[PDB]
Design a protein around this ligand. Structure first.
Ligand SMILES: CC(C)CCn1nc(-c2cccs2)c(O)c(C2=Nc3ccc(O[C@H](C)C(N)=O)cc3S(=O)(=O)N2)c1=O
Length: 557
């Protein structure tokens, strides 16, 4: 069926939207090529609508069915609990879109009974009605990029009351099921370093490794009613409370499978018959579905000694090469199978034979050296989008601080250390806002993070090694340098200079700020300090960080 049917009503903004990089007094110290940076707005949503609107046909064979049977067997071993209203409420982000029923995320979080009452009525409705399509709002995402212009992505989501209901019914399922079903293939269980460890060991476990990433064209849109019912049947394999089963059946029939689309002005924009990107099960359903299709496609393609790594629609496969010609033919067959399953490629997959050249989750493994001179593998990515976004965040307060996420997730990298840490620590110093906790996202989930904890956070996620990496790869350095020329970011030598200042300014504050100065900026100075373990690092609640992915899932930790 058509992934979408549109009425003609526009996708409308709430607030007026800025597409142009806001410039303040700090902007130029990060970036000079301001016109390279933009934010998507609803005003390009029509282009997106066109892209995402197509017919899906699906042809399911025995490999598909075998894998599903296997997945269901693993899923039958999971037991999940219903969350209480209160618990579901506490997982709601403070910025989460307000209900149309006259209450907002903050009413939910501090548990006003106006919200709780409504949520209870939503839940009772979900139990009583398993057929009535649930209304959804379609919005254009405002996200920041560097010009290559992408149209806005679309966010489709049910009312706040329904979302708390999704959490009650499904939060535990989407938190536990994926790792049980997909085992080590489930990408969201990995910190970046564990992700590197997995990729590195898997690569090394092959006599002749070949790897490829598979780009599905608009994954959400290729997701069919059948896919969404299949994933429900996987959920229902779990040991669930009877109300959980009912709510899941009902959210599936009424929401997940499809539904009417309403813009922010209240007009009907049409109808959706594919994955909604603003629901709890977006990440988990995509992951399962991507895994299901891809594992079946690996069998179709007779890929040998095949290891998958899946995060939502992001798939990377490492397997035994059969030589470039056979590999290419394998990927064609893999692609035809995926296509038959309604997951056709954007860019057709290409075999790669160097781990460091495989991009997956927009990242690649790279190598630098620790203090010992010993080679170390770590995760990096092209810094262009991070820096674009840092530039936006340099002038604008934003609900999510990508800079802070990037420093955390990419702490060991050259660009996060020399540029992100230097710039933003500089800004925090100047505003004496070092102590203020900032919201950032990790695997789609919102965390409140205190910048002063970065050293302990990075020691925990990455090891002290991340504060000592040097002698980065030529291809990594060239990518960064090239990125800096594109965006007009000052060279790494300026950043080193600045960092020496930022470091001393931090050391002078003493305490946590001084620890930030000490660890975060040890690289900056000729004559270095001894980076020993940080006692407080071992006191950090890093439980929940890399358990599952929660994008579009309206999740706050
Ligand atoms: C280990 C890590 C470095 C790999 C790169 N990386 N980085 C992040 C970051 C979060 C915050 C700063 S960087 C991050 O949150 C993600 C990340 N990966 C996704 C992949 C595919 C995804 O697909 C969704 C399910 C869909 N198609 O609907 C979603 C994500 S994510 O959970 O938003 N976040 C990620 O992959």
């Amino acid at each position: 069926s058509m992934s979408y049917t549109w009425t003609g009503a526009l996708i409308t903004p709430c607030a007026a939207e800025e597409s142009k990089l806001p410039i303040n007094a700090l902007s130029n110290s990060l970036l000079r090529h301001h016109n390279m940076v933009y934010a998507t707005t609803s005003r390009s949503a029509g282009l997106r609508q066109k892209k995402v609107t197509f017919d899906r046909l699906q042809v399911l064979d025995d490999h598909y069915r075998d894998v599903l049977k296997e997945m269901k067997a693993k899923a039958s071993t999971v037991k999940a609990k219903l969350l209480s209203v209160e618990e579901a409420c506490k997982l709601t982000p403070p910025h989460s879109a307000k209900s149309k029923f006259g209450y907002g995320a903050k009413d939910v979080r501090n548990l006003s009974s106006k919200a709780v009452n409504h949520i209870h009525s939503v839940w009772k409705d979900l139990l009583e009605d398993t057929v009535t399509p649930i209304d959804t709002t379609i919005m254009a995402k405002n996200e920041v990029f560097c010009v290559q212009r992408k149209p806005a992505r679309l966010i489709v989501f049910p009312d706040l009351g329904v979302r708390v209901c999704e959490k009650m019914a499904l939060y535990d399922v989407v938190s536990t099921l994926p790792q049980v079903v997909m085992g080590s293939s489930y990408g969201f269980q990995y910190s970046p370093g564990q992700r590197v460890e997995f990729l590195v060991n898997t690569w090394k476990s092959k006599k002749n490794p070949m790897g490829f990433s598979y780009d599905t064209r608009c994954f959400d849109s290729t997701v069919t009613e059948n896919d969404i019912r299949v994933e429900e049947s996987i959920y229902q394999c779990c040991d669930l409370a009877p109300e959980a089963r009912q709510a899941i059946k009902s959210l599936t029939e009424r929401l997940y499978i499809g539904g009417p689309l309403t813009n922010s002005k209240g007009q009907n924009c049409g109808y959706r018959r594919c994955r909604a990107s603003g629901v709890l099960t977006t990440s988990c359903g995509n992951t399962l579905t991507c895994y299901l299709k891809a594992s079946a496609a690996c069998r179709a393609a007779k890929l040998q000694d095949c290891t998958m790594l899946v995060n939502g629609d992001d798939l990377v496969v490492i397997c035994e090469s059969a030589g470039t010609q056979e590999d290419a033919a394998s990927l064609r067959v893999f692609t035809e199978a995926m296509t038959r399953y309604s997951a056709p490629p954007g860019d057709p997959p290409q075999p790669e034979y160097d781990l460091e050249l495989i991009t997956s989750c927009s990242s690649n493994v790279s190598v630098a050296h620790d203090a010992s001179g010993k080679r170390v593998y770590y995760l990096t990515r092209d810094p262009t989008t991070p820096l674009a976004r840092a530039a936006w965040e340099t002038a604008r307060h934003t609900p999510v601080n990508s800079w802070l996420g990037n420093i955390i997730m990419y702490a060991p990298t050259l660009w996060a250390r020399m540029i992100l840490m230097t710039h933003f620590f500089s800004i925090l110093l100047a505003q004496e806002q070092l102590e203020k906790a900032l919201d950032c996202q990790i695997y789609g989930a919102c965390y409140s993070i205190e910048p002063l904890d970065l050293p302990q956070i990075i020691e925990r996620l990455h090891g002290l090694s991340a504060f000592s990496l040097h002698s980065y790869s030529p291809g990594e350095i060239n990518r960064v340098a090239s990125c800096l020329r594109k965006l007009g970011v000052p060279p790494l030598r300026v950043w080193r200079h600045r960092a020496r200042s930022v470091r001393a300014r931090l050391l002078s504050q003493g305490g946590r700020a001084a620890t930030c100065g000490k660890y975060l900026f040890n690289w900056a100075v000729k004559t270095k300090l001894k980076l020993t373990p940080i006692p407080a690092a071992s006191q950090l609640d890093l439980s929940g960080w890399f358990v599952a992915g929660y994008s579009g899932g309206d999740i706050y930790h």
